[PDB]
Design an enzyme around this catalytic site. Structure first.
Site, PDB file in Angstrom:
ATOM      1  N   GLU A  22     -13.412  13.005  12.256  1.00 31.50           N
ATOM      2  CA  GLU A  22     -12.560  13.344  11.105  1.00 31.50           C
ATOM      3  C   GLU A  22     -13.216  14.574  10.510  1.00 31.50           C
ATOM      4  OE1 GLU A  22     -10.300   9.151   9.952  1.00 31.50           O
ATOM      5  OE2 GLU A  22     -11.045  10.393   8.290  1.00 31.50           O
ATOM      6  N   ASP A  49      -8.468   4.243   8.117  1.00 31.52           N
ATOM      7  CA  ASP A  49      -9.704   4.504   7.363  1.00 31.52           C
ATOM      8  C   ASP A  49     -10.023   3.368   6.413  1.00 31.52           C
ATOM      9  OD1 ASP A  49      -9.868   7.078   8.487  1.00 31.52           O
ATOM     10  OD2 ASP A  49      -8.946   8.083   6.802  1.00 31.52           O
ATOM     11  N   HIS A  67       0.790  -1.231   0.000  1.00 36.28           N
ATOM     12  CA  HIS A  67       0.000   0.000   0.000  1.00 36.28           C
ATOM     13  C   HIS A  67       0.820   1.277   0.000  1.00 36.28           C
ATOM     14  CE1 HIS A  67      -4.266   0.114  -0.690  1.00 36.28           C
ATOM     15  NE2 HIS A  67      -4.143  -1.220  -0.655  1.00 36.28           N
TER      16      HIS A  67
END
Ligand SMILES: *Cc1cc2c(cc1C)nc1c(=O)[nH]c(=O)nc-1n2C[C@H](O)[C@H](O)[C@H](O)COP(=O)(O)OP(=O)(O)OC[C@H]1O[C@@H](n2cnc3c(N)ncnc32)[C@H](O)[C@@H]1O
Ligand SMILES: *[C@@H]1O[C@H](CO)[C@@H](O[C@@H]2O[C@H](CO)[C@@H](O)[C@H](O)[C@H]2NC(C)=O)[C@H](O)[C@H]1NC(C)=O
Ligand SMILES: CC(C)=CCNc1ncnc2[nH]cnc12
Ligand SMILES: *[C@@H]1O[C@H](CO)[C@@H](O)[C@H](O)[C@H]1NC(C)=O
Ligand SMILES: *[C@@H]1O[C@H](CO)[C@@H](O)[C@H](O)[C@H]1NC(C)=O
Length: 499
Positions: free
Chosen positions: A253, A138, A74
């Site tokens: 957030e 997330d 990632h």
């Protein structure tokens, strides 16, 4: 040139591969900007295979191969590559069945997870035993070892700290090839070095993760603002410690929307309906706003008979302390796992459009609270204006008290600092170059304004930049630790710290 028996054994068993299909898969990452082919890929079936490679590496004088540990690749800028070296395909550790790679403790207080395991699986094995980790990312398709080598942040970190603050102990194979169990009590110098350590000291084969009783549902809210001062004051109110103790919110957030792509970006949240979008677009026009901000918050709750009405009352009390535009509170109510995995859906949707496996010139940083209004003016209301934004602009405050400065992860000095994640997706090669220059321009703006930020998920290519990143005193400590756990400077070379 000779090979140890255990190293040559891995070649013999088809574990150490050199074929073009194996090397090419371990040569690209999510970033899709940089590439570097390894000389070999290791597909280990047990931790003994990682001991074999690393003991070989430490015993063999003049060993030339760098070693990386590919979680799920990632990484944005090749941090998981081993150019002309050996890439470890971590996922191979969970291929068998026996023994299981995820074990919830009998007491329900923690979860033991393989370094290679992905958080979505950690969540499923935890939920089966009525528990769940407390601090997330997330996006759930990342590895335990990968997020732990960075920090691991989401809207729960203000109150539980990042993922690196929710680890009881780990099993680490150093660059010397030694299996070491570590915690704050046992070999704490290694435990601290590894957490936020960017894969420099060794590989995490096991991490003991703190859990809490699993909530059943999440009351999910979005609050809309046209005033940055009101938006940031409210995110800070929601995340402020109350006189060790926190407010009712489980997750906080926020997001920025630039005027030029307003209706499209609001519709792309997967949160607002077309009627909600039209009302916000109209609001922006009335206030003559070039930017719109949204707070995203949740309130976790159990399956209880009164729970729903109790949540309505608790949420109503919280919202009454806020300053969002009157009538601009938007609510949803989902199962807890569905909230946590809300991003997987975005991955699926984007992939079929051919919009996921594209360059991601993401800009992620930690900005001290005292300079967030300056960053908003220079960036959201400045640099980014007049551009078409493809992606999300996430902004939210974090509490430094929940971060352990003795760990490797670098943060600003202030008590409160914001995670700022500018998640741009490239639409063309000329758009990629424009986006890479825009990110350099944002960082230059911050440097010239004296903003003492820290990057996150970025790799520096200059020694002076990595020293400024950790801080000179903290840098000396990182060096001391490298000399102890990877003196040959082979581990995770793609970070460009010692390579
Ligand atoms: C792609 C992506 C990434 C991401 C995200 C959303 C998407 C779509 N949302 C995030 C969030 O909300 N919060 C957060 O903190 N990070 C978020 N990310 C970034 C993610 O943490 C990083 O990509 C990170 O690297 C984790 O990904 P992965 O698990 O795929 O790890 P890697 O990229 O292959 O390797 C990263 C470095 O760590 C070393 N490494 C990897 N595994 C280990 C183990 N087990 N032990 C020791 N070192 C390890 C690699 O060598 C590399 O240097
Ligand atoms: C927000 O962006 C829109 C464009 O999406 C602007 O609306 C345009 O305004 C220009 C010049 O004033 C006109 O030529 C266009 O006909 C408008 N297009 C649309 C689709 O409305 C608007 O001015 C912007 N608002 C702010 C405050 O910057
Ligand atoms: C810190 C970081 C990279 C957060 C990313 N968070 C995300 N949050 C929401 N949607 C997303 N899509 C891709 N990434 C997403
Ligand atoms: C980017 O991804 C595309 C699609 O898979 C591919 O054509 C290309 O090789 C990738 N580039 C890099 C540098 O990884
Ligand atoms: C609307 O805001 C813009 C850009 O922020 C400013 O240039 C313009 O003069 C504004 N209009 C009024 C009537 O204030």
């Amino acid at each position: 040139r000779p090979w140890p028996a255990s190293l040559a054994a891995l070649a013999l068993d088809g574990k150490l591969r050199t074929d073009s299909n194996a090397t090419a898969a371990a040569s690209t990452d999510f970033g899709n900007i940089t590439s570097a082919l390894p000389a070999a890929v290791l597909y280990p079936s047990s931790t003994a295979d990682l001991v074999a490679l690393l003991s070989a590496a430490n015993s063999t004088p003049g060993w030339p191969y760098t070693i990386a540990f590919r979680g799920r690749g990632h990484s944005l800028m090749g941090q998981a590559f081993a150019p002309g070296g050996v890439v470890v395909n971590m996922a191979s550790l969970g291929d068998a069945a026996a023994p299981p790679r995820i074990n919830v403790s009998a007491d329900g207080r923690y979860v033991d997870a393989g370094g290679e395991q992905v958080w979505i699986d950690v969540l499923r094995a935890s939920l089966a035993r009525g528990v769940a980790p407390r601090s997330w990312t997330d996006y759930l398709y990342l590895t335990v070892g990968g997020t732990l080598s960075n920090a691991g942040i989401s809207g729960q970190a203000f109150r539980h700290g990042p993922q690196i603050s929710n680890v009881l102990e780990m099993d680490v194979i150093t660059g010397h090839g030694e299996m070491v169990t570590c915690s704050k009590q046992l070999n704490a110098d290694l435990f601290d070095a590894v957490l936020g350590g960017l894969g420099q000291f060794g590989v995490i084969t096991r991490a003991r993760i703190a859990v809490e009783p699993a909530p059943a549902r999440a009351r999910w809210v979005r609050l809309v603002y046209t005033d940055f001062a009101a938006f940031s004051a409210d995110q800070e109110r929601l995340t402020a410690p109350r006189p060790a103790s926190f407010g009712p919110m489980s997750y906080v957030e926020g997001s920025v929307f630039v005027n030029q792509s307003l209706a499209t970006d609001l519709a792309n949240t997967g949160f607002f309906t077309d009627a909600d979008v039209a009302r916000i677009v109209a609001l922006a026009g009335e206030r003559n706003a070039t930017t719109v901000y949204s707070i995203e918050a949740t309130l976790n709750y159990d399956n209880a008979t009164a729970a729903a009405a109790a949540v309505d009352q608790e949420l109503a009390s919280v919202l009454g302390t806020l300053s969002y535009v009157e009538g601009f509170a938007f609510q949803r109510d989902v199962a807890y796992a569905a909230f946590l995995d809300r991003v997987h859906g975005e991955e699926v949707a984007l992939n079929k459009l051919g919009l996921w496996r594209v360059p991601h010139p993401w800009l992620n940083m930690f900005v001290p609270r005292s300079r967030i209004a300056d960053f908003d003016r220079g960036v959201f209301k400045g640099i980014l204006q007049g551009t078409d934004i493809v992606g999300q602009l996430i902004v939210y405050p974090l509490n430094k008290s929940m971060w352990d400065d003795g760990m490797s992860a670098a943060t600003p000095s202030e008590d409160v600092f914001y995670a700022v994640s500018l998640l741009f997706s490239s639409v063309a090669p000329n758009d990629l170059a424009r986006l890479q220059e825009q990110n350099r321009r944002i960082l230059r703006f911050c440097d010239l304004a004296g903003i003492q930020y820290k990057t996150y998920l970025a790799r520096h290519t200059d020694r002076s930049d990595w020293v400024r990143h950790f801080g000179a005193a903290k840098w000396n400590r990182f060096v001391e630790m490298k000399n102890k756990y990877d003196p040959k400077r082979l581990l995770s070379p793609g970070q460009d710290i010692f390579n």
